[PDB]
Curated annotation (Swiss-Prot), chains A, B:
Lineage, uppermost ranks: Viruses, Riboviria, Orthornavirae, Pisuviricota, Pisoniviricetes
Cell compartments where the protein resides: Host cytoplasm; Host Golgi apparatus
Domain of life, source organism: Viruses
Known partners and oligomeric status: Exists as monomer and homodimer. Only the homodimer shows catalytic activity.
Stated name of the protein: 3C-like proteinase nsp5
Ranges of the Cytoplasmic topological domain: 1-299
Every Peptidase C30 domain range: 1-299
Organism encoding this protein: Severe acute respiratory syndrome coronavirus
Effect listed in the UniProt record for changing residue 188 to P: In strain: Isolate BJ02
Its biological purpose: Cleaves the C-terminus of replicase polyprotein at 11 sites. Recognizes substrates containing the core sequence [ILMVF]-Q-|-[SGACN]. Also able to bind an ADP-ribose-1''-phosphate (ADRP). May cleave host ATP6V1G1 thereby modifying host vacuoles intracellular pH.
Amino acid sequence: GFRKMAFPSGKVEGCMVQVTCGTTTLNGLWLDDTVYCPRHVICTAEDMLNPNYEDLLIRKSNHSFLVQAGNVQLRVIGHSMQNCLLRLKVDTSNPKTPKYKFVRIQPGQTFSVLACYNGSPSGVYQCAMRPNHTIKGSALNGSCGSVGFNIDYDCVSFCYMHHMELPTGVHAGTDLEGKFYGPFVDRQTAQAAGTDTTITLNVLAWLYAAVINGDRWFLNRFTTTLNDFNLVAMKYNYEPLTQDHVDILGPLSAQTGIAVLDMCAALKELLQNGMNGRTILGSTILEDEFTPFDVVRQC
Amino acid sequence: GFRKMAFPSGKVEGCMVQVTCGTTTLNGLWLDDTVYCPRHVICTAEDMLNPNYEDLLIRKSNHSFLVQAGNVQLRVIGHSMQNCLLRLKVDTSNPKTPKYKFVRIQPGQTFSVLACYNGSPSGVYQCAMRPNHTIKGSALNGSCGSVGFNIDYDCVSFCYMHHMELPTGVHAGTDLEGKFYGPFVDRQTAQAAGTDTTITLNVLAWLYAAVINGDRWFLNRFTTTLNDFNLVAMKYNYEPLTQDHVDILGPLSAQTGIAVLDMCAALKELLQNGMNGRTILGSTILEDEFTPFDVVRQC
């Protein structure tokens, strides 16, 4: 098979804290002398129906916030609001602060989430930002203040923070500047996600990972155009494949000697005929949570 | 629940080393002042056809083994063999040793694997020990010396270490006493693997997780005995369900208000009729890599 691996979580584990404001407690990211958490930590369940955050935050002081790093009480010496984030200045700088970056990822791109339970690391999983700008998972999977990240050598690129749980186990979130992904907001209203689609570029990359691991049964002599593939793509709830996408599949096409549009033809047949008791990389379904970058790296 | 979370890998990351003997390099486990790795590190390709481990090791000095933790080269001052493991005494105790136990797990049980390339933590995944005593994955997923573990409270329970990649593309390995799971040996030969049945207990645990998370379309009013359920289950390559398994699902049964045998009749119908394009916890297939303990822990 081909395991959907999360990044080793060690560097992010040392950064997780809990933040308590009144009766509300959630997770926060402790980097240097700042703690980052969702701004709705200052909101009770009642407050969430129509929250005036500037109105609610003026009533708070530095002592309104209880920050705890494991068994250690951190002392907050400043507070401010950056978009949908609460920024807390503390009197101690995190000695386990790794090399880090804040990045804004694109839909269809992947990252690891370290699910945390009131400051404490519980589990890690790999996921993709869905085309509808949501992250799938349970209440624990998307526990508020839990962060998404990529690790590139020694540097942690933080790209996501869990904020809201939408109906039927769907999560909405923010980057590390507090800007939401998608048309979502930090209040309890009716928020429907858009139409979720299969990440076509990702499926193709995973089919290339299949070939690299010796799985070849799905390939064919057939040839398709980009337009005729996208006619079959939309029919089965797949994302349109841009010319820019076929460029990104260059290195994987070269490594296997299989032309992108030939793999599209293979995908087309798979979409129309199914797998018929056969597996690809030990799977009965077409995986879409591996980017070309993930495949090249893990192959 | 929904997402198949691995444990936070932090405590295990600080234990990973690379061990080199001759032309072979693999992963090792550094705990206190001992380094654990597969004994076949002392073997070349030709050795692996018919390895005489006693003889191969007898003319190896302490200097024959190169061990490095990150960039620190560890001085090996002892060597011995524990079953299929090499035990290398080093001059320094691992300062990053966590509280740990070695345990042998049962087939169908779950653990996390920190996959490593030449001592460097690469990724982390959650898996189950198959009923045929194998672990599915790629070459990197099961790269020699990578360990499996659970984290219970503050304590790391190491249970598994990758040794061999089997012809089928699956992986064989030992516990941390060096005793293989299943009828496998550390020699490059033809090896009979049993049938990979579906872990029935785990599917039922997962169906309970679905109910708890408000996904209960698969439930019906039908009844069944353990005997009659197995006659259907044996036909779809599910392992027999025992009274012991029924008892294990007792707490989840009481929590959901759904009797085990009723959940069995729900499964029976799912096996016969299929899911019919519907999803359970966002999945189009039935998951068998969550234990009852995993379900309770994550819900």
